[PDB]
Design a protein around this nucleic acid. Sequence first.
DNA 1: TAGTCTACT
Lengths: 193, 192
Amino acid sequence: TIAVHAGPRPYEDQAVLGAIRAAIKGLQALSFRYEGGSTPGRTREVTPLGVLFGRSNYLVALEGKGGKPRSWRLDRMSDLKVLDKPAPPPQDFSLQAFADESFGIYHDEIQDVVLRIHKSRAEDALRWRFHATQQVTPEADGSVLVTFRAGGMRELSWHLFTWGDAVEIVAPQVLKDMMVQELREAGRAHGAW
Amino acid sequence: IAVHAGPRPYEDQAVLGAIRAAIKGLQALSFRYEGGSTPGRTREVTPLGVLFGRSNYLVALEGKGGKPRSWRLDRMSDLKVLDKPAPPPQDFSLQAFADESFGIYHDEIQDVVLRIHKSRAEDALRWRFHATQQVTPEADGSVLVTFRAGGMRELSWHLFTWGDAVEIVAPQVLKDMMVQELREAGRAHGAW
DNA sequence: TAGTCTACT
Protein backbone atom coordinates (compact mmCIF):
# COMPACT_ATOMS: atom_id res chain seq x y z
CA THR A 1 0.00 0.00 0.00
CA ILE A 2 1.01 3.63 -0.73
CA ALA A 3 -2.13 5.42 0.50
CA VAL A 4 -3.79 4.84 3.89
CA HIS A 5 -6.87 6.40 5.49
CA ALA A 6 -6.05 7.06 9.11
CA GLY A 7 -8.48 6.56 11.92
CA PRO A 8 -11.38 4.36 13.05
CA ARG A 9 -13.80 2.72 10.65
CA PRO A 10 -16.25 -0.19 10.48
CA TYR A 11 -14.81 -3.63 10.15
CA GLU A 12 -15.03 -4.54 6.44
CA ASP A 13 -15.21 -8.02 4.80
CA GLN A 14 -12.11 -8.04 2.53
CA ALA A 15 -13.53 -10.80 0.32
CA VAL A 16 -16.58 -8.66 -0.45
CA LEU A 17 -14.43 -5.63 -1.28
CA GLY A 18 -12.24 -7.94 -3.34
CA ALA A 19 -15.12 -9.23 -5.48
CA ILE A 20 -16.39 -5.68 -5.97
CA ARG A 21 -12.93 -4.52 -7.07
CA ALA A 22 -12.49 -7.48 -9.41
CA ALA A 23 -15.87 -6.88 -11.09
CA ILE A 24 -15.10 -3.19 -11.63
CA LYS A 25 -11.61 -3.98 -12.93
CA GLY A 26 -13.05 -6.55 -15.37
CA LEU A 27 -15.93 -4.35 -16.48
CA GLN A 28 -18.06 -7.35 -15.41
CA ALA A 29 -21.40 -7.76 -13.71
CA LEU A 30 -21.59 -8.56 -9.98
CA SER A 31 -24.30 -10.55 -8.19
CA PHE A 32 -24.98 -10.78 -4.48
CA ARG A 33 -27.68 -11.71 -2.03
CA TYR A 34 -28.99 -8.58 -0.31
CA GLU A 35 -30.47 -8.86 3.22
CA GLY A 36 -32.45 -5.66 2.94
CA GLY A 37 -34.53 -3.33 0.84
CA SER A 38 -37.84 -4.45 -0.64
CA THR A 39 -36.99 -8.14 -1.14
CA PRO A 40 -34.47 -9.47 1.41
CA GLY A 41 -32.51 -12.61 0.52
CA ARG A 42 -32.99 -12.17 -3.24
CA THR A 43 -30.00 -12.44 -5.63
CA ARG A 44 -29.31 -9.04 -7.33
CA GLU A 45 -27.22 -8.57 -10.50
CA VAL A 46 -25.64 -5.12 -10.83
CA THR A 47 -23.15 -2.99 -12.73
CA PRO A 48 -20.78 -2.09 -9.90
CA LEU A 49 -19.60 1.52 -9.93
CA GLY A 50 -17.60 2.10 -6.71
CA VAL A 51 -17.66 2.05 -2.91
CA LEU A 52 -18.58 4.78 -0.44
CA PHE A 53 -16.62 4.56 2.80
CA GLY A 54 -17.81 6.09 6.04
CA ARG A 55 -19.39 5.22 9.35
CA SER A 56 -21.11 2.61 7.20
CA ASN A 57 -19.80 1.31 3.86
CA TYR A 58 -21.79 0.99 0.67
CA LEU A 59 -21.58 -0.44 -2.79
CA VAL A 60 -22.65 2.03 -5.48
CA ALA A 61 -24.17 0.13 -8.43
CA LEU A 62 -26.91 0.05 -11.11
CA GLU A 63 -29.44 -2.78 -11.07
CA GLY A 64 -30.59 -3.63 -14.59
CA LYS A 65 -30.18 -1.87 -17.90
CA GLY A 66 -31.11 1.80 -17.68
CA GLY A 67 -31.39 1.47 -13.93
CA LYS A 68 -30.40 4.42 -11.78
CA PRO A 69 -27.41 4.20 -9.43
CA ARG A 70 -28.22 3.17 -5.87
CA SER A 71 -26.34 2.55 -2.62
CA TRP A 72 -26.30 -0.87 -0.96
CA ARG A 73 -24.93 -1.61 2.51
CA LEU A 74 -21.84 -3.83 2.33
CA ASP A 75 -22.72 -5.44 5.58
CA ARG A 76 -26.07 -6.55 4.14
CA MET A 77 -24.44 -8.25 1.10
CA SER A 78 -23.52 -11.93 0.90
CA ASP A 79 -22.66 -14.59 -1.69
CA LEU A 80 -20.86 -12.20 -4.04
CA LYS A 81 -20.18 -13.58 -7.50
CA VAL A 82 -18.12 -11.91 -10.24
CA LEU A 83 -20.10 -12.83 -13.33
CA ASP A 84 -18.94 -13.91 -16.81
CA LYS A 85 -21.06 -11.15 -18.22
CA PRO A 86 -19.99 -7.70 -19.42
CA ALA A 87 -21.23 -4.66 -17.55
CA PRO A 88 -19.55 -1.48 -18.76
CA PRO A 89 -20.25 1.57 -16.57
CA PRO A 90 -21.90 4.78 -17.86
CA GLN A 91 -19.35 7.20 -19.35
CA ASP A 92 -21.10 10.10 -17.59
CA PHE A 93 -20.83 8.74 -14.09
CA SER A 94 -19.12 10.60 -11.24
CA LEU A 95 -18.84 8.79 -7.91
CA GLN A 96 -18.35 12.05 -5.96
CA ALA A 97 -21.34 13.61 -7.74
CA PHE A 98 -23.28 10.54 -6.67
CA ALA A 99 -22.06 10.85 -3.08
CA ASP A 100 -23.22 14.43 -2.91
CA GLU A 101 -26.37 14.66 -5.06
CA SER A 102 -27.95 11.17 -4.87
CA PHE A 103 -26.64 9.90 -1.52
CA GLY A 104 -27.45 10.57 2.10
CA ILE A 105 -30.86 10.75 3.79
CA TYR A 106 -31.57 13.35 6.44
CA HIS A 107 -33.92 12.20 9.15
CA ASP A 108 -33.92 15.66 10.81
CA GLU A 109 -35.04 18.98 9.42
CA ILE A 110 -32.80 20.69 6.85
CA GLN A 111 -31.27 23.96 8.09
CA ASP A 112 -29.43 26.98 6.76
CA VAL A 113 -26.16 26.64 8.68
CA VAL A 114 -24.05 29.71 9.45
CA LEU A 115 -20.62 29.23 11.06
CA ARG A 116 -18.01 31.85 11.87
CA ILE A 117 -14.47 30.43 12.08
CA HIS A 118 -11.96 32.43 14.16
CA LYS A 119 -9.02 33.94 12.24
CA SER A 120 -6.60 31.58 14.01
CA ARG A 121 -8.16 28.74 12.02
CA ALA A 122 -9.02 30.70 8.89
CA GLU A 123 -6.40 28.70 6.96
CA ASP A 124 -8.18 25.47 7.64
CA ALA A 125 -11.58 27.08 7.02
CA LEU A 126 -10.61 28.27 3.55
CA ARG A 127 -9.53 24.76 2.47
CA TRP A 128 -12.35 22.88 4.19
CA ARG A 129 -15.29 21.18 2.38
CA PHE A 130 -18.13 21.18 4.87
CA HIS A 131 -20.61 20.48 2.09
CA ALA A 132 -20.57 19.97 -1.67
CA THR A 133 -22.41 23.34 -1.89
CA GLN A 134 -21.11 25.97 0.54
CA GLN A 135 -20.16 29.64 0.53
CA VAL A 136 -17.02 30.85 2.32
CA THR A 137 -16.68 34.57 2.99
CA PRO A 138 -13.58 36.14 4.55
CA GLU A 139 -14.48 38.95 6.91
CA ALA A 140 -12.78 42.20 7.83
CA ASP A 141 -11.41 40.97 11.16
CA GLY A 142 -9.81 37.89 9.62
CA SER A 143 -12.58 35.48 10.56
CA VAL A 144 -14.37 33.37 7.93
CA LEU A 145 -18.14 32.93 7.42
CA VAL A 146 -19.17 29.47 6.17
CA THR A 147 -22.75 28.88 5.00
CA PHE A 148 -24.44 25.77 3.60
CA ARG A 149 -27.88 24.11 3.67
CA ALA A 150 -28.06 20.61 5.14
CA GLY A 151 -29.61 18.35 7.72
CA GLY A 152 -27.69 16.11 10.11
CA MET A 153 -27.30 18.56 12.97
CA ARG A 154 -26.10 15.93 15.45
CA GLU A 155 -23.38 14.60 13.13
CA LEU A 156 -22.46 18.20 12.30
CA SER A 157 -22.11 19.02 15.98
CA TRP A 158 -19.72 16.05 16.32
CA HIS A 159 -17.56 17.48 13.53
CA LEU A 160 -17.71 21.01 15.00
CA PHE A 161 -16.26 19.59 18.24
CA THR A 162 -12.95 19.10 16.35
CA TRP A 163 -12.71 22.87 15.81
CA GLY A 164 -12.64 23.49 19.54
CA ASP A 165 -13.12 27.11 20.55
CA ALA A 166 -12.44 28.35 17.03
CA VAL A 167 -15.98 27.97 15.60
CA GLU A 168 -19.04 30.05 16.50
CA ILE A 169 -22.41 28.59 15.60
CA VAL A 170 -24.27 31.64 14.25
CA ALA A 171 -27.40 29.82 13.02
CA PRO A 172 -29.70 27.91 13.32
CA GLN A 173 -30.78 27.89 16.96
CA VAL A 174 -31.41 24.14 16.77
CA LEU A 175 -27.74 23.59 15.95
CA LYS A 176 -26.74 25.69 18.98
CA ASP A 177 -29.10 23.54 21.09
CA MET A 178 -27.77 20.31 19.56
CA MET A 179 -24.17 21.33 20.26
CA VAL A 180 -25.09 22.04 23.90
CA GLN A 181 -26.96 18.72 24.20
CA GLU A 182 -24.06 16.69 22.85
CA LEU A 183 -21.52 18.58 24.97
CA ARG A 184 -23.63 18.15 28.13
CA GLU A 185 -24.06 14.42 27.44
CA ALA A 186 -20.33 13.79 27.08
CA GLY A 187 -19.36 16.34 29.73
CA ARG A 188 -21.49 14.55 32.31
CA ALA A 189 -20.16 11.14 31.22
CA HIS A 190 -16.50 12.16 31.46
CA GLY A 191 -16.63 14.45 34.49
CA ALA A 192 -15.97 17.70 32.65
CA TRP A 193 -18.69 19.69 34.46
CA ILE B 1 -13.51 4.12 -7.37
CA ALA B 2 -13.79 5.00 -3.62
CA VAL B 3 -15.24 8.14 -2.04
CA HIS B 4 -15.17 8.87 1.73
CA ALA B 5 -18.15 10.68 3.23
CA GLY B 6 -18.23 13.66 5.53
CA PRO B 7 -16.43 16.97 5.81
CA ARG B 8 -12.90 16.82 4.49
CA PRO B 9 -10.36 19.13 2.94
CA TYR B 10 -10.48 19.71 -0.75
CA GLU B 11 -8.08 17.41 -2.64
CA ASP B 12 -5.38 18.40 -5.17
CA GLN B 13 -5.11 15.50 -7.59
CA ALA B 14 -2.15 17.20 -9.30
CA VAL B 15 -0.16 16.98 -6.06
CA LEU B 16 -1.41 13.47 -5.28
CA GLY B 17 -0.55 12.36 -8.79
CA ALA B 18 2.97 13.75 -8.62
CA ILE B 19 3.55 11.94 -5.32
CA ARG B 20 2.20 8.62 -6.63
CA ALA B 21 4.40 8.94 -9.75
CA ALA B 22 7.49 9.57 -7.66
CA ILE B 23 6.71 6.60 -5.42
CA LYS B 24 6.05 4.32 -8.38
CA GLY B 25 9.26 5.37 -10.07
CA LEU B 26 11.40 5.16 -6.90
CA GLN B 27 12.23 8.80 -7.52
CA ALA B 28 13.03 11.70 -5.25
CA LEU B 29 10.51 14.45 -4.69
CA SER B 30 11.27 18.13 -4.06
CA PHE B 31 8.97 20.88 -2.73
CA ARG B 32 8.99 24.13 -0.84
CA TYR B 33 7.53 23.45 2.59
CA GLU B 34 5.65 26.13 4.59
CA GLY B 35 5.74 24.42 7.99
CA GLY B 36 8.13 23.12 10.63
CA SER B 37 11.40 24.85 11.49
CA THR B 38 12.36 26.36 8.07
CA PRO B 39 9.20 27.49 6.23
CA GLY B 40 9.48 28.25 2.50
CA ARG B 41 12.68 26.23 2.15
CA THR B 42 13.03 23.61 -0.60
CA ARG B 43 13.15 20.03 0.70
CA GLU B 44 14.28 16.91 -1.16
CA VAL B 45 12.69 13.75 0.22
CA THR B 46 12.25 10.07 -0.33
CA PRO B 47 8.43 9.80 -0.72
CA LEU B 48 6.84 6.84 1.04
CA GLY B 49 3.07 7.20 0.75
CA VAL B 50 0.04 9.37 1.44
CA LEU B 51 -1.89 9.49 4.72
CA PHE B 52 -5.56 10.58 4.35
CA GLY B 53 -7.30 12.26 7.31
CA ARG B 54 -7.33 15.72 8.95
CA SER B 55 -5.59 17.85 6.24
CA ASN B 56 -3.90 15.51 3.63
CA TYR B 57 -0.27 14.36 4.34
CA LEU B 58 2.72 13.03 2.41
CA VAL B 59 4.76 10.49 4.40
CA ALA B 60 8.39 10.93 3.47
CA LEU B 61 11.88 10.85 4.93
CA GLU B 62 14.71 13.33 4.55
CA GLY B 63 18.47 12.73 4.86
CA LYS B 64 20.64 9.69 5.62
CA GLY B 65 18.83 7.49 8.14
CA GLY B 66 15.90 9.88 8.32
CA LYS B 67 12.82 8.39 10.01
CA PRO B 68 9.31 8.88 8.00
CA ARG B 69 7.65 12.19 8.75
CA SER B 70 4.22 13.62 7.90
CA TRP B 71 4.05 16.65 5.59
CA ARG B 72 0.82 18.55 5.05
CA LEU B 73 -0.05 18.71 1.36
CA ASP B 74 -1.35 22.29 1.63
CA ARG B 75 2.01 23.42 3.00
CA MET B 76 3.78 21.94 -0.05
CA SER B 77 4.36 23.91 -3.21
CA ASP B 78 6.61 23.84 -6.27
CA LEU B 79 6.29 20.06 -6.42
CA LYS B 80 8.92 18.39 -8.61
CA VAL B 81 9.42 14.72 -9.37
CA LEU B 82 13.18 14.55 -9.72
CA ASP B 83 14.76 12.36 -12.39
CA LYS B 84 16.88 10.77 -9.70
CA PRO B 85 16.48 7.58 -7.63
CA ALA B 86 15.41 7.63 -3.99
CA PRO B 87 15.20 4.06 -2.68
CA PRO B 88 12.79 3.66 0.28
CA PRO B 89 13.87 1.72 3.38
CA GLN B 90 13.49 -1.99 2.63
CA ASP B 91 11.21 -2.77 5.57
CA PHE B 92 9.02 0.38 5.64
CA SER B 93 5.29 -0.30 6.00
CA LEU B 94 2.97 2.65 5.48
CA GLN B 95 0.16 0.86 7.37
CA ALA B 96 2.45 0.29 10.35
CA PHE B 97 3.32 3.99 10.31
CA ALA B 98 -0.36 4.93 10.25
CA ASP B 99 -1.10 2.45 13.05
CA GLU B 100 1.27 4.31 15.45
CA SER B 101 -1.64 6.71 16.08
CA PHE B 102 -5.37 6.62 16.55
CA GLY B 103 -5.42 9.42 13.96
CA ILE B 104 -2.62 11.44 12.40
CA TYR B 105 -0.58 12.73 15.29
CA HIS B 106 2.46 10.60 16.30
CA ASP B 107 3.02 11.15 20.00
CA GLU B 108 3.55 8.76 22.90
CA ILE B 109 1.81 5.44 22.29
CA GLN B 110 -0.75 4.68 25.03
CA ASP B 111 -2.49 1.58 26.26
CA VAL B 112 -6.15 2.62 25.89
CA VAL B 113 -8.95 0.90 27.79
CA LEU B 114 -12.59 1.82 27.09
CA ARG B 115 -15.86 0.48 28.46
CA ILE B 116 -18.83 0.62 26.08
CA HIS B 117 -22.31 0.51 27.63
CA LYS B 118 -24.51 -2.48 26.77
CA SER B 119 -26.74 -0.28 24.64
CA ARG B 120 -23.87 0.19 22.14
CA ALA B 121 -21.96 -3.06 22.74
CA GLU B 122 -23.04 -4.65 19.45
CA ASP B 123 -21.97 -1.50 17.58
CA ALA B 124 -18.60 -1.61 19.32
CA LEU B 125 -18.04 -5.22 18.17
CA ARG B 126 -18.54 -4.04 14.56
CA TRP B 127 -16.33 -0.96 14.93
CA ARG B 128 -12.59 -1.04 14.27
CA PHE B 129 -11.19 1.56 16.64
CA HIS B 130 -7.65 0.46 15.82
CA ALA B 131 -5.70 -2.40 14.27
CA THR B 132 -4.60 -3.55 17.77
CA GLN B 133 -8.20 -3.75 19.09
CA GLN B 134 -9.26 -6.53 21.46
CA VAL B 135 -12.81 -6.71 22.83
CA THR B 136 -13.87 -8.50 26.02
CA PRO B 137 -17.58 -8.91 26.86
CA GLU B 138 -18.57 -8.34 30.46
CA ALA B 139 -21.27 -10.32 32.24
CA ASP B 140 -23.49 -7.20 32.59
CA GLY B 141 -23.45 -6.72 28.82
CA SER B 142 -20.83 -3.95 28.65
CA VAL B 143 -17.74 -4.51 26.53
CA LEU B 144 -14.16 -3.56 27.35
CA VAL B 145 -12.11 -2.39 24.37
CA THR B 146 -8.32 -2.20 24.39
CA PHE B 147 -5.86 -0.95 21.84
CA ARG B 148 -2.43 0.65 21.71
CA ALA B 149 -1.96 3.96 19.90
CA GLY B 150 -0.83 7.56 20.21
CA GLY B 151 -3.07 10.51 19.31
CA MET B 152 -5.17 11.12 22.38
CA ARG B 153 -6.63 14.42 21.11
CA GLU B 154 -8.01 12.84 17.99
CA LEU B 155 -9.20 9.90 20.04
CA SER B 156 -11.08 12.27 22.34
CA TRP B 157 -12.78 13.83 19.28
CA HIS B 158 -13.89 10.36 18.18
CA LEU B 159 -15.10 9.36 21.64
CA PHE B 160 -17.36 12.42 21.65
CA THR B 161 -19.45 10.63 18.99
CA TRP B 162 -20.25 7.82 21.45
CA GLY B 163 -21.87 10.20 23.89
CA ASP B 164 -22.61 8.78 27.30
CA ALA B 165 -22.14 5.24 26.09
CA VAL B 166 -18.32 5.20 26.53
CA GLU B 167 -16.31 5.25 29.74
CA ILE B 168 -12.57 6.09 29.54
CA VAL B 169 -10.81 3.58 31.84
CA ALA B 170 -7.19 4.31 30.86
CA PRO B 171 -4.85 6.12 30.43
CA GLN B 172 -5.14 9.12 32.71
CA VAL B 173 -3.80 11.38 29.98
CA LEU B 174 -6.81 10.42 27.84
CA LYS B 175 -9.26 11.31 30.62
CA ASP B 176 -7.46 14.66 30.98
CA MET B 177 -7.51 15.26 27.23
CA MET B 178 -11.22 14.48 26.94
CA VAL B 179 -12.06 16.76 29.88
CA GLN B 180 -10.04 19.64 28.49
CA GLU B 181 -11.45 19.40 24.98
CA LEU B 182 -14.97 19.24 26.44
CA ARG B 183 -14.30 22.23 28.70
CA GLU B 184 -12.92 24.29 25.84
CA ALA B 185 -15.89 23.51 23.58
CA GLY B 186 -18.39 23.78 26.42
CA ARG B 187 -17.22 27.30 27.28
CA ALA B 188 -17.16 28.32 23.61
CA HIS B 189 -20.68 27.07 22.97
CA GLY B 190 -22.21 28.09 26.30
CA ALA B 191 -23.05 24.55 27.31
CA TRP B 192 -22.27 25.27 30.97
C1' DT C 1 -4.11 20.94 27.40
C1' DA C 2 -0.62 23.79 26.94
C1' DG C 3 6.88 21.78 23.61
C1' DT C 4 11.21 20.49 21.59
C1' DC C 5 11.54 19.92 14.91
C1' DT C 6 13.82 17.24 9.45
C1' DA C 7 6.54 16.37 10.92
C1' DC C 8 1.95 16.25 12.36
C1' DT C 9 -3.43 16.74 16.20
